[PDB]
């Protein structure tokens, strides 16, 4: 931002963006795991089908 006391606005804006982005990366990880817990189950059925 090249000016002082605008970097406090920018660093707080990155801080709330990182807090949201780490939540979504946490959320899509347990959503991928909840899918793969259901999807891997009965592939030995599904391959035989």
């Amino acid at each position: 931002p090249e000016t002082p006391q605008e970097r406090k606005e920018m660093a707080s804006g990155v801080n709330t963006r990182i807090d949201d982005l780490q939540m979504v990366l946490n959320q899509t990880e347990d959503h991928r795991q909840r899918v793969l817990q259901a999807a891997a189950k009965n592939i030995r059925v599904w391959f035989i089908k």
Binding site: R17, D20, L21, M23, V24, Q27, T28, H31
Partner: protein, 212 residues
């Protein structure tokens, strides 16, 4: 055959009960008459209430997706091979003729936001890129307003899907929902107890932040 009898028989659940017979398709003569029953229904209506027999009947059922592989099969009777091509061309227009945004505007302004093929079709969202801004970006602001005040165990997943498909087709709309605070609403609604509104809002919140 007679036209006034078609609006007499429509006081029932006829065609999705009949499409349940169509998906079995074991006898190979029941499907030749139940596709002819779909044609003699659809051809002999003098009204705009053929669209009553898509919503109940055709677009909202597991028949139009079945008619794609019905074309792929190798039938011998020549009237069947023209029955499918008549039904495919009649229902080929029938998906995008309400996929207009008007209806969608009839859906959005009146409410209730139902599950419709206009939401899953990308040719809808290919067209109405700037149409929310044609309505002075209220048309989005009326959509996040019904997303805000109501709990909506079914149509909130539709409302979360509607903001997701617009954002992928207009990058400036990501800044628009930031001014309205709708992103923090999707942040709350993705943590909901229902799984359908959770899965739709998770795709909605991850479409907001593809690039930052």
């Amino acid at each position: 055959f007679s036209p006034q009898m078609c609006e007499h028989l429509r006081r029932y659940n006829i065609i999705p009960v009949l499409s349940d017979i169509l998906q079995e398709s074991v006898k190979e003569k029941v499907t030749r008459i139940i596709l002819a029953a779909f044609r003699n229904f659809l051809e002999k209506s003098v009204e705009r209430e053929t669209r009553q027999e898509y919503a109940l009947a055709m677009i909202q059922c597991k028949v139009l997706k079945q008619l794609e592989n019905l074309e792929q099969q190798k039938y011998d009777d020549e009237d069947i091979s023209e029955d499918i091509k008549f039904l495919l061309e009649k229902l080929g227009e029938s998906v995008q003729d309400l996929s207009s945004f008007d209806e969608y505007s009839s859906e959005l302004k009146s409410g209730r936001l139902e599950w419709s093929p206009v939401h899953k079709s990308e040719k809808f969202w290919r067209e109405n890129a700037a149409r929310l801004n044609e309505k002075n970006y209220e048309l989005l602001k009326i959509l996040t307003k019904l997303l805000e005040v109501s709990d909506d165990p079914q149509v909130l997943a539709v409302a979360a899907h509607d903001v997701g498909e617009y954002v992928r087709h207009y990058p400036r709309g990501k800044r628009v929902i930031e001014q309205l605070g709708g992103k923090q609403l999707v942040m709350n609604h993705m943590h909901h107890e229902d799984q359908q509104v959770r899965y739709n809002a998770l795709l909605a919140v991850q479409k907001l932040m593809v690039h930052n």
